RNA sequence: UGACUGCUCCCUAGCAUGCUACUACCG
RNA sequence: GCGGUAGUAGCAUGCUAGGGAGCAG
């Protein structure tokens, strides 16, 4: 059940990743898009977290974006 | 359906037929009564069915339209919904280093590329007060999204080399303090 | 069968459509008449007019549907992407085309 | 479905005979009125529906009319958007050096794979390596089908501008790299 | 930017057929 | 007294047309 749940928030994670205009960047959508494949493709709960780590990276650095105080504010992430 | 002026009519002659019926008469007055009565019978019983037609329609009509302004509404708010639904997930992961990183991104620590996971490979980060180099950053070494790091070179907002020696707490508020570490991950 | 082996010494350049030039009221346009096949040899169209006047609309279908005019009317391509031979490119610019994920 | 031809008979019919019936009569005007009435009725009836089915089949006929009538309007469209492209594309065929190539011909047939080759004034290189750059378009100039090009324009993949002084070994893995080099026929066609 | 086939479920409209019913005409 | 015919209503059956969706090669 904890391999599933990763595997489902990698999806929304690319979803979200996409909305933002991200693959006017080759390099970075070919990236991301390795990872995600890589993602769903695990057998074991270790590896899809690292590369689940290395994914929210990307979403982390891009500074206008997203307020993450504000969706940490409703209730929602700590 | 006993709002029409049908089943008035209807009403009345099979009271007054039934009336008379329970009195005792001939024939010729059933027979009357019935001609008179059958026909209003039907009257009534053509509107009881297409009233019960229309009104099913009505309703499955307005079904439809709250089906489709529903819709249309939903397509409209994709990226707020992606977004809390997202870090709702994340929320319920519970994982170490993910809340890690994302409670030093949220109190202004990100970094600048995609985190590696090789024994090698630079990672970039942006400190912007002492506080968080105080909690992350203390001697030579770098903690960040659960592993170490070695800290390899400082540079301010002026691109200048800063040795770590420097950053003190009373000798850091003269310095470009958004600084930038690129370390490597520690084996 | 046999041709199938022969055709295989030919230089590849000369296998396709067979073109040439017709005028429609004056003006001139480059159609196929013909095709070069590797199994079938040549073969030549059997109805085909080099002087007409305006033509009707099953004849601008087969104009518009035949790839003489847009390989005559384009670019130059060499792509080392692939080992395919290539004829040419119609436009300035490739299309990089990518393929979304699902929804939750 | 108030004004029918018959509908002015059977309603005089009928007021005349329900009359004769409210001024207490005896039952042979009774039994007039209502062979009367009832012939009177199976005479509308038809009189009723007839119409009604007429007027259906003329909707039905106007509808399928109009429908042709678009129809018609959208394929007049489609002629003229076609002769328009056709028109609009044949104003770049270099009609000199395909008229030269034309001649040369022994009946006046050429291969169609070859027109691009010997007529095309620009040239498109797409490489995917710098391996493969250095081999196919290094320096300013090169060869290719026979013919001198020279280079006029250099993009990546997200399409900008990039300028042969960084596209190096070093700098190699900074670059979008489906690079697209774009090239002019020196001496010859542009 | 969205190919060619095959099968199945749901909703509406029309046509044909059948069952029952209510009046009326005819013998 | 029985049958035929003409409209009207409800119900059932099979096709055609339109729309929405699912699976397979």
Same mark, same amino acid.
């Given at each position: 059940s904890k391999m599933s749940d990763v595997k489902c928030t990698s999806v929304v994670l690319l979803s979200v990743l996409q909305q933002l205009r991200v693959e006017s960047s080759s390099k970075l959508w070919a990236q991301c898009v390795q990872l995600h494949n890589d993602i769903l493709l695990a057998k074991d709960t270790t590896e899809a977290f690292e590369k689940m780590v290395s994914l929210l990276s *990307?979403?982390?650095?891009?500074?206008?974006? *997203?307020?993450?105080?504000?969706?940490?504010?409703?209730?929602?992430?700590? | 359906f006993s709002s029409l002026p049908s089943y008035a009519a209807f009403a009345t002659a099979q009271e007054a037929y039934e009336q008379a019926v329970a009195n005792g008469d001939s024939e010729v007055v059933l027979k009357k009564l019935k001609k008179s009565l059958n026909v209003a019978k039907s009257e009534f019983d053509?509107?009881?069915?297409?009233?019960?037609?229309?009104?099913?329609?009505?309703?499955?009509?307005?079904?439809?339209?709250?089906?489709q302004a529903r819709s249309e509404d939903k397509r409209?708010?994709?990226?707020?919904?992606?977004?809390?639904?997202?870090?709702?997930?994340?929320?319920?992961?519970?994982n170490d280093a993910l809340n890690n990183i994302?409670?030093?991104?949220?109190?202004?620590?990100? !970094?600048?590329?995609?985190? !590696?996971?090789?024994?090698?490979?630079?990672?970039?980060?942006?400190? !912007?007060?002492?506080?968080?180099?105080?909690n992350t950053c203390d001697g030579t070494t770098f903690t960040y999204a659960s592993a170490l790091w070695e800290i390899q070179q400082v540079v301010d907002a002026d691109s200048k080399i800063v040795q770590l020696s420097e950053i003190s707490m009373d000798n850091s508020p003269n310095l470009a303090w958004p600084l930038i570490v690129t370390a490597l991950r520690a084996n | 069968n046999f041709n199938v082996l022969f055709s295989t010494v030919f230089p590849p350049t000369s296998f396709g459509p067979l073109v040439r030039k017709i005028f429609v009221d004056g003006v001139p346009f480059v159609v196929s008449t013909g095709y070069h096949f590797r199994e079938l040899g040549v073969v030549h169209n059997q109805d085909v007019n080099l002087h007409s006047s305006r033509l009707s609309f099953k004849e601008l279908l087969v104009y518009a549907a035949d790839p003489a005019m847009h390989?005559?009317?384009?670019?130059?391509?060499?792509?080392?992407?692939?080992?395919?031979?290539?004829?040419?490119?119609?436009?300035?610019?490739?299309?990089?085309?990518?393929?979304?994920?699902?929804?939750?």
């Amino acid at each position: 059940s904890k391999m599933s749940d990763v595997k489902c928030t990698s999806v929304v994670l690319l979803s979200v990743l996409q909305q933002l205009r991200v693959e006017s960047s080759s390099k970075l959508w070919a990236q991301c898009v390795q990872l995600h494949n890589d993602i769903l493709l695990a057998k074991d709960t270790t590896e899809a977290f690292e590369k689940m780590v290395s994914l929210l990276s *990307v979403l982390l650095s891009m500074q206008g974006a *997203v307020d993450i105080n504000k969706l940490c504010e409703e209730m929602l992430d700590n | 359906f006993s709002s029409l002026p049908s089943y008035a009519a209807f009403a009345t002659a099979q009271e007054a037929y039934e009336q008379a019926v329970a009195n005792g008469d001939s024939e010729v007055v059933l027979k009357k009564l019935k001609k008179s009565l059958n026909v209003a019978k039907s009257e009534f019983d053509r509107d009881a069915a297409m009233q019960r037609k229309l009104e099913k329609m009505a309703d499955q009509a307005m079904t439809q339209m709250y089906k489709q302004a529903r819709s249309e509404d939903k397509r409209a708010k994709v990226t707020s919904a992606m977004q809390t639904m997202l870090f709702t997930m994340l929320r319920k992961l519970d994982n170490d280093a993910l809340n890690n990183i994302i409670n030093n991104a949220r109190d202004g620590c990100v !970094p600048l590329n995609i985190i !590696p996971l090789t024994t090698a490979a630079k990672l970039m980060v942006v400190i !912007p007060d002492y506080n968080t180099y105080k909690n992350t950053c203390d001697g030579t070494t770098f903690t960040y999204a659960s592993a170490l790091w070695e800290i390899q070179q400082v540079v301010d907002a002026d691109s200048k080399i800063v040795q770590l020696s420097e950053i003190s707490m009373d000798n850091s508020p003269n310095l470009a303090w958004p600084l930038i570490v690129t370390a490597l991950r520690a084996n | 069968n046999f041709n199938v082996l022969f055709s295989t010494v030919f230089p590849p350049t000369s296998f396709g459509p067979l073109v040439r030039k017709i005028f429609v009221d004056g003006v001139p346009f480059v159609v196929s008449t013909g095709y070069h096949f590797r199994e079938l040899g040549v073969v030549h169209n059997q109805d085909v007019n080099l002087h007409s006047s305006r033509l009707s609309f099953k004849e601008l279908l087969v104009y518009a549907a035949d790839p003489a005019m847009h390989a005559a009317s384009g670019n130059l391509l060499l792509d080392k992407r692939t080992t395919c031979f290539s004829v040419a490119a119609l436009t300035n610019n490739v299309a990089f085309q990518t393929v979304k994920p699902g929804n939750f």
